[PDB]
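pasting for the record
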Amino acid sequence: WIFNTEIFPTVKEKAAILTKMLAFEIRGEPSLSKLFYEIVLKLFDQEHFNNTEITVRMEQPFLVGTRVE
C-alpha cells in the first residue's frame, strides 16, 4: 500500500492504518512488530529532504521505535 503512488486519495488513511500496528509489541508479537518497524525504517530510508511519508511517521512510531528493546 504505502510504497507506491496511486489514486488512493490521501495518505492519512495509510497513516491511520499503520499507526494501529503499535499493538504488536503490547500484545506480545515480536515478529510482526519487527516487520512493522522495518517498513517504517524503510519509509524513512528513501527520504533525505522529502515528504514521501506523512509527518505522523516522524511522530508516533519513530519515537516508539527508539524504545523497542
